[PDB]
Design a protein that fits this description.
CATH topology of chain A: Immunoglobulin-like
CATH architecture of chain A: Sandwich
Oligomer: homodimer
Shape of chain A: globular
Number of helices of chain A: 0
Protein name (chain B): Fibronectin
PDB class: signaling protein
CATH class of chain A: Mainly Beta
CATH superfamily of chain A: Immunoglobulins
Strand order of the largest sheet of chain A: 4-3-6-7
Strand content of chain A: over 45%
Largest sheet of chain A: 4 strands, antiparallel
Keywords: sulfation, acute phase, glycoprotein, cell adhesion, pyrrolidone carboxylic acid, heparin-binding, phosphorylation, alternative splicing, signaling protein
Radius of gyration of chain A: 13 Å
Order of helices and strands of chain A: EEEEEEE
Organism (chain B): Homo sapiens
Largest interface: A-B, 16 and 16 residues
Subcellular location (chain B): Secreted, Extracellular space, Extracellular matrix; Secreted
Structural class of chain A: mainly beta
Number of domains of chain A: 1
Number of strands of chain A: 7
Chain lengths: 96, 94
């Protein structure tokens, strides 16, 4: 059960960015769906689809001293409505 | 579920410490059990029990440029019941 990206980690952080990392699950994935936004912020979450082979991503264009939630989904299916894993997320704050 | 600590966060990190934060669950709890250790490792894993009302904790005495895992779970009741754990991984600065 559950083959979401594994060990999501906040590797490093700056006032405007964050290096996030993870290990791909056991099942083959077509791509990683990554979303992020201010924690508890009633504003549109930024989403980014990455090559399933990626194990890192640097989020940029963020506000300093801000709390953000990053969420990853493994997309294993094909089509415009592909099969997806349950969500996996972590929170962090950018430097001031 | 409703007993699990909310939005566990790595607020700030240094070469040997990390400020961890989270929101208290909506339900009444007695303690917060926080365990941390090097991610994937044979190094000892230390556990601390915190008052259920504490919402932050600073882990110190860590090694620079190292991957650590922190798991949190709440304890409710007398003598008790535990929530499923929640965790996050971070790396200390180099």
């Amino acid at each position: 059960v559950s083959d979401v990206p594994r060990d999501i980690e906040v590797v490093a952080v700056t006032p405007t960015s964050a290096l996030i990392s993870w290990d791909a699950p056991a099942v083959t994935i077509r791509y990683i769906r990554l979303t992020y936004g201010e924690t508890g912020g009633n504003s549109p979450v930024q989403e980014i689809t990455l090559p399933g082979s990626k194990s890192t991503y640097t989020i940029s264009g963020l506000k300093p001293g801000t709390d953000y939630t990053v969420t990853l989904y493994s997309v294993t299916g094909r089509g415009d409505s592909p099969a997806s894993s349950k969500p996996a997320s972590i929170n962090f704050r950018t430097e001031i």
